[PDB]
Symmetry: D2
Subunit: 142 residues, 4 copies
Amino acid sequence: TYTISIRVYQTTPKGFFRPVERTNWKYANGGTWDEVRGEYVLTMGGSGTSGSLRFVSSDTDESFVATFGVHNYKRWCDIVTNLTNEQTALVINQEYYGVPIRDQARENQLTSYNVANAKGRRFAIEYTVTEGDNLKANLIIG
Amino acid sequence: TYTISIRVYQTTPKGFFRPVERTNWKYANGGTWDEVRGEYVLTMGGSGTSGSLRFVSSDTDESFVATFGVHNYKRWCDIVTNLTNEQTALVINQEYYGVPIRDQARENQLTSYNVANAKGRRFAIEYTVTEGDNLKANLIIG
Amino acid sequence: TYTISIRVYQTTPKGFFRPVERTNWKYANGGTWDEVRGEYVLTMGGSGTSGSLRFVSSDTDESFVATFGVHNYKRWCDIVTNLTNEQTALVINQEYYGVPIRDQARENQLTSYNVANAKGRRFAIEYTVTEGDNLKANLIIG
Amino acid sequence: TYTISIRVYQTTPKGFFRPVERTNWKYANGGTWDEVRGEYVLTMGGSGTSGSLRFVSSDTDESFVATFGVHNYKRWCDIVTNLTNEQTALVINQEYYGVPIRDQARENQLTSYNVANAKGRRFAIEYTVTEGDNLKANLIIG
């Protein structure tokens, strides 16, 4: 059993990102999202699946989907921003298992990733514990 | 803009269902899930989309997905239980837009629905406000 | 270190009780409230303190304070209802350390307790795990 | 009726502050805490009362209590850090109605306040809406 426990950091009072969606991919017996001691915890039965979180800032018309998983026993992550209204986390989560560019992001098995939106704001995932059964990550909103 | 505000009633202290997933379908400019005063609020851009909540009772190996939406300007709902390990809310929500047995349920535009799992536990949705932009429902776990 | 993990059951769709307050008494180095996997978790460094939760049903003008703690290495609980507007959880929690009738409730070290309000609705605390470091309780709203 | 809607910004991925306590003072018919769209909402019956939030970073042995209220029809705020183990939000909130050094802070009716703990970490409250029934504030953790 894997857990990925995520701490969210909003670094500037410019805009306000709120959680709006949390999804689980169907592989490796699925998985769950729990809130535990102020953290978002993704639990998976083993390697080969993932889950996504979407955050929205209605004040500034900004949003992103952050995806976390394990591929061949190594943690991975990605962030997608500049979302269309059709790009919910339900949509994005699935793309990592069929869309070549997204497949590659998962295959990269990154301990850290960052991307900025068209408005200039950067988002980052940083795994602080990168090995073992209880992985930990910071989700940093710039 | 539509909202569906959901109050969850867990009625029986045998097992414990916890929220594990909340999804948004991509049609009608998508949507969001918010927690508001102890309720789950699904907000949608217009008619033709939906969102799902999955609950799991790990103590008793039980689970269900409850889906809420608006089809042709009328509210709808459905519950799926006796889930396989592959049937996350991400999977189930999407099935309402392509899978015949799910399409028909959506097209029924029900104000109430109930189902029992193999263990005999009843799950129910009852809309308490069935008209207008701001709909309300009870989700009752038996 | 003690934890008391509380599962809330709302047994009837009549009214809707929502969480509005959570307090920690100052003895035995205080304590904390956490949300963990859908449960309310009170953590205390040792015996001799407590914490309170207040729930309100605005629909029906009902409310109660539920208090949980450990006294001389035995768990205790109490519920106060028919609250005046001045009886917040901050107020009620403290009364178990100075008010004779409340002191007695704590000294009783109950594994279960129930009380009904003037409107006829009953509330109950039921400890399902009554011994050890990780205590568990059902909070049942009738 | 007053509301104070609070957005929490945790700006630095060194340590992690989690919400552990939320209290309501007894004056002006008390009040409630609600979670609304990712924000903390303190609702009060009238002028002359307050509510407190405690946050703890267990990883770095840091904590603070942030208090928000209305005094003589003007909003006020304060932060207390470098807390002893006995100083829960239950304790701190009550001190604003009897303890001279706390009374004076409330009477200042501040729209903004900041303080640093012994480790040099800054905590700040800034009201973004300073007039009317529905007030807004940022709680910024440095």
